[PDB]
Amino acid sequence: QEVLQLQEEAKTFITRENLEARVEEALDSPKSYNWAITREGLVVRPQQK
Amino acid sequence: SNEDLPVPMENPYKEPLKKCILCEKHVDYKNVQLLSQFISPFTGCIYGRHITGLCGKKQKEITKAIKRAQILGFMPVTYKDPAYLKDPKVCNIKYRE
Amino acid sequence: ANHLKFIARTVMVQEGNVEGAYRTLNRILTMDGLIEDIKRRRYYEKPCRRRQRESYETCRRIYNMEMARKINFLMRKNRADPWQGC
Amino acid sequence: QDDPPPSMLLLDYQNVPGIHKVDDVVKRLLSLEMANQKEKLKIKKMQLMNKVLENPEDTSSLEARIVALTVK
Amino acid sequence: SSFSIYPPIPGQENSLRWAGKKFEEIPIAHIKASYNNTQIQVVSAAHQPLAHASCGTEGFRNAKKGTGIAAQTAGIAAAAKATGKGVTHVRVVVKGLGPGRLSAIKGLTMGGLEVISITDNTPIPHXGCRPRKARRL
Amino acid sequence: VESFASMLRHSPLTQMGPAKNKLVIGQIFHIVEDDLYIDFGGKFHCVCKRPEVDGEKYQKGTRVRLRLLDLELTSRFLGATTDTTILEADAVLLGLQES
Amino acid sequence: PRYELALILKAMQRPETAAALKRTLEALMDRGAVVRNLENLGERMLPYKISAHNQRHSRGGYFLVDFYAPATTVESMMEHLSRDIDVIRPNIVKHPLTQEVKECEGIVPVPLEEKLYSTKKR
RNA sequence: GAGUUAAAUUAUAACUAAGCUGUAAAAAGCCCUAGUUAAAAUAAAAUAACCCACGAAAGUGACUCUAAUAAUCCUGACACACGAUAGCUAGGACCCAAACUGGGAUUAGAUACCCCACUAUGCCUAGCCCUAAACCCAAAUAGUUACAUAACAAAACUAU
Ligand code: FES
Ligand SMILES: [K+]
Ligand SMILES: [Mg+2]
Ligand SMILES: [Mg+2]
Ligand SMILES: [Mg+2]
Ligand SMILES: [Mg+2]
Ligand SMILES: [Mg+2]
Ligand SMILES: [Mg+2]
Ligand SMILES: [Mg+2]
Ligand SMILES: [Mg+2]
Ligand SMILES: [Mg+2]
Ligand SMILES: [Mg+2]
Ligand SMILES: [Mg+2]
Ligand SMILES: [Mg+2]
Ligand SMILES: [Mg+2]
Ligand SMILES: [Mg+2]
Ligand SMILES: [Mg+2]
Ligand SMILES: [Mg+2]
Ligand SMILES: [Mg+2]
Ligand SMILES: [Mg+2]
Ligand SMILES: [Mg+2]
Ligand SMILES: [Mg+2]
Ligand SMILES: [Mg+2]
Ligand SMILES: [Mg+2]
């Protein structure tokens, strides 16, 4: 199972052939890991703004 | 022959143990909002267990995660980031009286 | 020195009084323990004294917080005795 | 002294079938190049006992433990 | 009347102007309240000094200048010199912990000067230079 | 003759289960100016204050409704070999019994 | 992923920012690293002024790179980024996804400890 | 081992001020100073810590990476390895603290407590010295709560 998922994950790895495309794509799709937590333990996502 | 005697069984009314705020959740050093809620906004200190209320496992992880962001350049050291000053309050300390 | 100014340890007065605002600032520092920290940093304490100080602060905190619970626990037993002269 | 070859699959990812049919990218990720010193010790211990010990499956035997200490 | 203790962040735009100028344009009053002296200096928004006053310069000498009254008089004198140059509101920054913290704060208020924000900037090392040894008095 | 073991099984106390958050009715046996000593059938007697509404009808022998929280208040403190009991019970008033 | 590169770059325009990432990713591949993906965190004001290469920086862009690399080449990657002047503060940490979130049951209450003193009459 | 720096401080520069440090109270010292703004190096590691983890002990609590914590799990020396701090030999660093020394004050005297200045040294690399209230004054491994209170303390005891 562990090697099977690496087989699929190897397709999206960045190679020198698509070095420019991945850099250009990354610069146009910002993302953040920020998320808050409440007293009851529920996750609040700031992406709703 | 008496069936009325009690049986050797565990307590059926054992209420589940209390879960901390961050139980079963993955802390990180990249989400400033999660780390910033446990820092005093005026001074920048880190709250203890008696204020934060977290358990013994997630309290150490938060402390290590916060300090990693202090040096790597992700959050201010001497004050809370003003952008996250309106996040919901989770600590139990009150300054205004 | 590198952080922005007038953000940390700062309060703003309201309605034009300054004595009230200052006392609010002192409570913030006292709660965070900076006031006692500055007092202990005027001179240097050897590490032998530092551990001896924390072994007395912790003992007082246990005794005070345990006697306090008994006071609250036995607080309800202060009503007038219904069996006076029984 | 022993020198495990660099381009070798680690201990766990060997007996699983269908490895040689995979592209070089995944094989590179499983070789000792992307493995720390801990994985290297497993390869040394596995090969060393297969050359001197008689019954590799027995661990509680004195000869098996002496081999393990020699690796450390 | 919703009033927030936290200062207005310069990044945002808060419609709270004193005497027609913004929050950062208001001059600064630095207060260094040591254990033997209290020094008061007012500087502009561009960190250009306007007036300087201290317990020593007001006639107090030696142990006398370390009392609260000496710091109270310095605040009145500093505000009087500052008001001459035409400053109404000032942001006071308190440096260190000493007996003259309260007196200097209210010294400016009674000297014809109005304060709106209080900041404590006591030097707090985080582990730093080793301080002097104890005093076995 | 009924065995003692059978008596406990069918007793109301056993059927209650945990004492926390249980609606148990009780009868007042002693009256003070502001304190109502109520016996709810437990080992000890709980004490409650007279409510501000319909307080004049809380007399001796009156039945009221209670919410038991602890059957017997008892805690352990450091240095105590045996716990120090309070000889009372904790309960709250939900009103008077609806006859 | 195995290693994560906390990369912070000096604020600049689109072309040189892409160029800086292009050669930085090239340097990783020369040391024997297979980069998984590139994540952009956008440009933000720095928490405090950071002095690097005789410059005072207040604004910079954050970028994250995760890759598989041999343990012996971590020093070379850190040393190479130190000499680069378009990066203000590089740091390398193990990827947080390598470790698994340990299962938890709850906050076990600790009873107060007894039998700490003799039973003699005090 | 390798790399890295937040808060404070100092060299240094600009501006204003004439005083600045210090004590129960003063003197001496400084005025090449003090306040604010800008800022290397060295050194030390706020809050977290009301947590009690790692190591055989002495010890360790700023961040990152690499290497890594013996024994299929008894006792054991004068043998092998290690051992805070102070001290020695050689090279390098020196913010700051600081035995010795000088000055001020106190005192009958003060070669002390108090105040100011500065050195060894505290630091890095290599070697040596092998001492502590190195004390949790309670030796290691298996256990029992039976018997039973000198005193005090941290309850009593059995086997090798
Ligand atoms: S109680 Fe589960 S992680 Fe805190
Ligand atoms: K520190
Ligand atoms: Mg600095
Ligand atoms: Mg120098
Ligand atoms: Mg003189
Ligand atoms: Mg100066
Ligand atoms: Mg400890
Ligand atoms: Mg051992
Ligand atoms: Mg071990
Ligand atoms: Mg032995
Ligand atoms: Mg030694
Ligand atoms: Mg030494
Ligand atoms: Mg030495
Ligand atoms: Mg000699
Ligand atoms: Mg030397
Ligand atoms: Mg020196
Ligand atoms: Mg000195
Ligand atoms: Mg002398
Ligand atoms: Mg010791
Ligand atoms: Mg001994
Ligand atoms: Mg011993
Ligand atoms: Mg022994
Ligand atoms: Mg042993
Ligand atoms: Mg034992």
Side-chain angles (χ1 to χ4, degrees), chain B residues 56-74:
Chain B
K57 295 183 179 181
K58 293 305 177 182
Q59 177 61 265
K60 191 60 178 182
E61 289 186 357
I62 284 300
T63 292
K64 302 301 293 296
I66 287 181
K67 274 193 168 185
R68 178 178 296 183
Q70 303 279 40
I71 307 299
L72 268 59
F74 280 88

Side-chain angles (χ1 to χ4, degrees), chain A residues 7-43:
Chain A
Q7 176 82 263
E8 182 70 20
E9 288 176 354
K11 299 300 182 298
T12 180
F13 286 166
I14 296 182
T15 60
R16 305 203 182 192
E17 298 292 339
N18 61 329
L19 180 61
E20 304 173 355
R22 294 301 300 267
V23 167
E24 185 271 349
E25 175 183 348
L27 281 175
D28 295 359
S29 61
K31 55 181 300 300
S32 305
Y33 295 104
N34 298 16
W35 57 266
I37 185 63
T38 52
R39 285 181 170 267
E40 51 182 359
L42 270 62
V43 178

